[PDB]
Amino acid sequence: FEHNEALVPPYNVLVDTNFLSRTVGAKLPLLESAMDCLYASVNIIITSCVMAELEKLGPRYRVALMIARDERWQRLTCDHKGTYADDCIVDRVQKHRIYIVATNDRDLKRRIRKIPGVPIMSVQ
């Protein structure tokens, strides 16, 4: 598609809040799942906005938070945690179309496909 590649191990993957919930309440090993599909070392991360949003969810749905605050995902310190998870990831990946995005938000995925060179992952 005319997109010049320069991705190198370990892949940087932003995991969104929905994916985190999902993998938690269905017992899906998110870390190993990504290393499996990317077939290489992966650094799994979550923006501060995504994990904050989880924090609210965490008030009545305990379990996502702990996994989401795990070193496996390493925090990506965005400048705008206040912005919906969706917009957060979008504004972070818009300058760094480098990072792979794992999201359950088919709306966020659609608007990321626009940007050349953004691997997209999700759970069926």
């Binding site: 598609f1 997109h3 190198v8 290393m35 990317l38 077939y39 290489a40 050349p116 060179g117 953004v118």
Partner: protein, 157 residues
């Protein structure tokens, strides 16, 4: 699309090495099981982790594998694909002078010429290991490789 820009990537590797197909598919799947079975470390040091260890680790390889480390060979999943590619004559036989430039290479690999220290090796996608012997052999004689030995300084990687 990612499908699209992928179908770009592949064509990139399509002479990032030299192929013409989906041997990129070959090497790919390889990388899978390599990782895969491997990544299924998991686990401990089960005397199994042991044999499998220095085992898959004895992937090395020459022209093949990594360099000196691991353990964690998923690095390969990064490489391998993007590394296992070279190694073999398909690659590491242009990067040795003889071959004027990939193309001007596979052709001799085939066309009788180009031989791995005794016996040709038409299988224009062998694999290299302890290479210093990858001469022409030839047995009036293999011309394209016998005089154009500008490889007389092919100190490359």
């Amino acid at each position: 699309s990612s499908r699209l820009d992928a179908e770009l990537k592949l064509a990139g590797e399509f002479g990032l090495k030299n192929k013409k197909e989906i041997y990129r598919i070959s090497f790919q799947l390889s990388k899978i099981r390599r990782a895969a079975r491997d990544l299924l470390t998991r686990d401990e040091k089960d005397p199994k982790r042991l044999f499998e260890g220095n085992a898959l680790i004895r992937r090395l390889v020459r022209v093949g594998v990594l360099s000196e480390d691991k353990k964690k060979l998923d690095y390969v999943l990064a490489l391998k694909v993007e590394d296992f590619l070279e190694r073999r004559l398909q690659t590491q036989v242009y990067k040795l002078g003889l071959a004027k430039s990939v193309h001007h290479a596979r052709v001799l690999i085939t066309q009788r010429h180009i031989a791995v220290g005794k016996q040709i090796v038409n299988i224009p996608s062998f694999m290299v290991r302890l290479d210093s012997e990858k001469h022409i052999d030839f047995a009036r004689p293999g011309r394209v490789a016998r005089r154009n030995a500008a490889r007389k300084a092919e100190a490359s990687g």
